[PDB]
């Protein structure tokens, strides 16, 4: 399920149709990390304030 906190803001989006993701939801990440879209695909990252 979705965890507390927010995903970090990102500067822009890579020009791929389907950037590969390493996670699809927060529960797939360890500890307090959230599954967040970066500039190019999703990864587990430390949360920022809500």
């Amino acid at each position: 399920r979705r965890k507390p906190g927010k995903c970090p803001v990102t500067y822009g989006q890579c020009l791929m149709l389907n950037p590969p993701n390493f996670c699809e939801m927060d529960g797939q990440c360890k500890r307090d990390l959230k599954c967040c879209m970066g500039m190019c695909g999703k990864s587990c990252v430390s949360p920022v304030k809500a």
Binding site: G12, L15, L17, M39
Partner: protein, 218 residues
């Protein structure tokens, strides 16, 4: 490419399609008979051993006799930062050498450190989305764009179409930006969605990497 036009068949014989499972996922540029260059983010998270390098293509929806297909043999990167998409450039050595002909030709690169000023007229191209969605392009598309420095990082070359909404779009990653016959950019990222009319499209600045490129291909 949103808001552009069809290229004439083989108008840009250095234009390359990178494919997985027979499907285009990124553009690239032929820079020697046995090397292409693309965006690092294109190959960062795919199986490089599975990538097919398609030269001499025009219509991705047709069988084309003009095509030459290679695998990737070796990979070269120079400080790619996936968080910020800095140094978003990769050189891929092919498992063979292209036959140079009407439809497959090597691109020309600018001098090391060459920076383009506001207003320089360039041509973007690619097989990415047409927008609407009109879906993905079968036929290679091209688009006249203008270099801009505002709302662009010094570590990028950026372009914006004057007075209407047009620009690169998803699937155009890795494709060349041609300025005065030279490859100055590799399509990297957009902001505000494709063809926002506000945010310039951002390219990896090829001229910043020419000495590094030559160190590999020469």
């Amino acid at each position: 490419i949103v808001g552009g036009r069809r290229a004439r068949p083989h108008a840009w014989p250095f234009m390359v399609s990178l494919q997985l499972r027979g499907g285009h996922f990124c553009g690239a540029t032929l820079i020697a008979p046995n090397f292409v260059m693309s965006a690092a983010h294109c190959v960062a998270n795919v199986n490089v051993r599975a990538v097919r390098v398609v030269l001499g293509a025009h219509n991705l929806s047709r069988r084309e006799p003009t095509r030459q297909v290679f695998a990737v043999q070796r990979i070269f990167e120079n400080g790619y930062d996936p968080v910020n998409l800095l140094n978003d450039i990769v050189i891929l050595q092919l498992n063979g050498s292209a036959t140079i002909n009407a439809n497959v030709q090597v691109a020309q690169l600018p001098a090391q450190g060459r920076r383009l000023g506001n207003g320089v007229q360039c041509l973007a191209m690619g097989w990415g989305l047409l927008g609407r969605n009109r879906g993905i392009a079968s036929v290679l598309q091209e688009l006249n764009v203008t270099v801009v420095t505002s709302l662009c990082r010094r570590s990028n070359v950026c372009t914006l179409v004057r007075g209407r909404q047009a620009g690169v779009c998803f699937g155009d990653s890795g494709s060349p930006l041609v300025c005065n016959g030279l490859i100055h950019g590799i399509a990297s990222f957009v902001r505000g969605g494709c063809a926002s009319g506000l945010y310039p499209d951002a390219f990896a600045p090829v001229a910043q990497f020419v000495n590094w490129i030559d160190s590999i291909i020469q």
